[PDB]
Every structure is written in structure tokens, then in C-alpha cells.
């Protein structure tokens, strides 16, 4: 493991963690739970990083550009192996690991709220499954659903809310498409529909896309980061394990250049991964304009294979093994850290807290935060939906984390194109903010009856898990008592809003 950026595989809680979540205060019992999770680990999106590096390898073999015969053979074996794994799985598809991530999250979701769901099975409580409508998010949800149902012995299968707009009529029939809360970052919805002009959802997505496309600070900071000399040095360092100085020198002065075509040249034809059927897996045929024209390009492509390889752990087996981690050992691990920063920086600036003086990058998550609260109200107010399980994307989680002020997402970069986001000046990391299957879950409990002092019902209370670790809400929020991670619903409605005001003494039970 190491420096996987937002390709970090989900770290499931150990038995100690899962058995030690805090108990709600005396008199409070479960009434609702909800979640939003990023899809699980996926393979390569297309025949691209693996394609281009194989074209480079073929040229190195022809021109004597590998450091040794053993090194040549090992590099080609690694590339062939990851390509073969993707051809078999289908490019872009959920990996075995990605399925297991969601299966486990689903199992433990039932287990943590066994009392809630056993009551629901008896009382007619219903479960709502939602996705953005994107196939990998829905398929992640399907695995969560399988795990949840196995853990509960099928006793909640008859308790699923029928969607009014299902993801599909087959395996995804239980999933309601909700791209306003799970794909708020784009006008174009995954199902081929688009948000309607004049609606809040449209403006949120459109204003955001226009903002990031044209913002001078983001553009300048990204140029500064793209020109980073130490990343260029790390690129050379990484590649010199494999290729000769003479070969890499020709790359650095433009004598070598590879395109994603049949022969690696611009005049080559459209290519397809070996063994793939273009009609069944269109993503096995890459875009020809994709290219390697510098050491930076080749090294970042190699780094991308290293991080996806971790996500493809289950496919790293038998007749299609690969060992990209061997290029990132010892001093070379520090190169991985540089490449991780380069990737994290782009996400940070475009989708995360980004630079000080704006909130355009993450205010877009407001519809999801609104729904997190609104679905609690629906239940508290007499509704039958006891859980809402949502499945979405890194583009959903990153701004959601920043808007909530979750750990890791509390620091904006300076308002500067030169004094930029770095690992030394910012806590944000893809690996911890938005790993594969990243998720936020809230549990809601209530004390029954009317408070004799108010003649009204007791305020419900809420507790959060982030990647299945129990965490406090943001520091402005006051919990129900000293030493508690439970918070009044009234308090969250105040303290999670943009003013972040606490109700103070009125937050205490
Ligand atoms: Zn296989
Ligand atoms: Zn060198």
C-alpha cells in the first residue's frame, strides 16, 4: 500500500471499531438511518494508460531502450496482465474489490441498526435505495443491497420502497434515480436526461461548471502545480528504473511521442485491447488523441496503473497477475507521494474546499445536505421510510465533505496562484476524504412521548459515521451532553447551515 490518492481502497472497520460505536443516551431508541456512499473500486476507464505504456514499451524493445532484458520482460508482463484483467472484467466496470466493499458496508449497515430494521420488518417500515442513475453507482448499490439482505436473512426484502423512476428494470429495479441530490455537479444526468433550466438544480450545476471552467485562481494555481519541477524530477526518477538515460533523453527532447493508435503513431488506426470485442466493450477501444509526449506523461500514466492495480487486487491473480507496486518501493515511494499530490491538487481545487474567498466549489452539495435533513423530518413527521441508502460519486462526496466540514476538508488554500495547496500546508488527502466506497452515515434516535415540561415531543438526536468511523459533527455544533457524539436535530439544522450558529444550552438534553 501507499499514496493511492482517491483510488485508496476502502478500509473496512475492524471488529473492535464496529463493536464500539457509542450507545444513544438512556431512553432513546432508533427511528431512522441514512447514507450516501461513493461507488466501489472500478477498473481502468478505457484502453488508454495501459495502451500508451505498451506502445512505449514496443518502441523501447525495438530501440534497446530498456535497462535490461529482465526489466523489459517484467514491464511488458505487468502491462499485459492489467490489460487482460480489464478485458475480462470489461473496462470501467466494478472490480471484485468494489463489489466486496459495498457488500460489507451493507452487511454492517443492517448489523449496526439491527433493532431499527427488525422493528421495521414487523411494523411495515420501508427502505429507500437511491442512485445517481450511473451504472457503477447503481451496481455498487446492488452489492450493498445483497450484503444487507444476507445479513438480515432476507427479512427486509418485502420492505423496499418501489421507485417511481427506477435505475433499470433488472438488477437495479429497487433504485430510485435522484440526480438532483446525487449528481448535482452537472446539468447532464447519467440516465441521458438533463436538469431543467429555471430550476434550482439546473442553476446549481450550471453556475458551478461555468465557475470552475473560467476561474482565474484555479487556473493559475493549477498551472503552478503543473509546472512543479520536483514532480518532473520524480517523473524522471521513476522511469529510470525501467528505461535507459539515452531513451528517456530522446523522449524529453521530442524525438519520441506515442499516440493511442495501433502502432503508437498519429497515422496509426483506432486500436482495441488484445482479446477484447469492440462491440461488447466499446471502452476497450481508446481515443486516438491520448498521448505520451514527455517523462511527466509516461510517469503519471505508470502511477495511474499503480493506483488502479490496488483497486484491481481481486483480479491480480493466476494467468493475469501484475506487480506495479515494485516500481514504487523505498525512495520511489516518495515519487508516488509527489504524483498523489499532483492528482489530489486538481480534485482539491475543482471539487473540494479549493481556495479561500469562495464557496462555489462545494456549495453545490447543499441539495444533498438538504435531503439528509429532510428525510429525517419525513420520518419524524410520521413517514414509513426508516432508511435512505444513496449511491453516488467522488464528485458527490468531495463537496459534501467540504460543506459539512468533515475531518480532512476543513482547510482552504490561500487566495493565490503561487502560494498553492501542498501536502505541507493542507490536511486534505484523496485517500482519506474520498477513498473508494467513501461514505457518510447518520443514525437517528428518539425518546418517546411528550416532555411533561413542554407538552411536546422530545427532539430527535443524530450521530455520524464517516467511512465507518464515529466522528463528531463540525466544531461549531454542540452535542446533547458533554462527552457525547449525539446531536439534537434542531442543533444540526442550525449548525450545519452556512452561519454555523449553535443553539447553545438549547442543544443539550
Ligand atoms: Zn481472468
Ligand atoms: Zn537519470
Author numbering: 7 to 515
Quote the passages of the study that discuss this structure, keeping the authors' original sentences.
The multiple inositol polyphosphate phosphatases (MINPPs) constitute a distinct evolutionary group within clade 2 of the histidine phosphatase superfamily. To gain a wider understanding of the implications of these insertions on the properties of these enzymes, we carried out a crystal structure and mutagenic analysis of a representative member, BlMINPP, a moderately thermophilic, membrane-anchored extracellular enzyme. The catalytic center of BlMINPP consists of the nucleophilic histidine (His-45), three arginine residues (Arg-44, Arg-48, and Arg-142), which coordinate the scissile phosphate during catalysis, and the amino acid triplet HAE (residues 339-401) where the glutamic acid residue acts as the presumed proton donor during catalysis.
To this end, crystals of the apoenzyme and of an inactive mutant in which the presumed catalytic proton donor Glu-401 was replaced by a glutamine (E401Q) were prepared, the latter in an attempt to trap the catalytic phosphohistidine intermediate. Analysis of the resulting structures indicates that, unlike previously characterized HP2P, BlMINPP possesses an unusual inherent flexibility. On binding the substrate analog, the enzyme moves to a closed conformation where the full array of interactions with ligand are present. This movement is not limited to the active center, as is seen in E. coli AppA, but rather it propagates to a large region of the α-domain, which we will refer to as the molecular “lid,” which rotates on binding of substrate toward the α/β-domain. The α/β-domain and the remainder of the α-domain undergo only limited changes and are considered fixed (RMS deviation 0.55 Å).
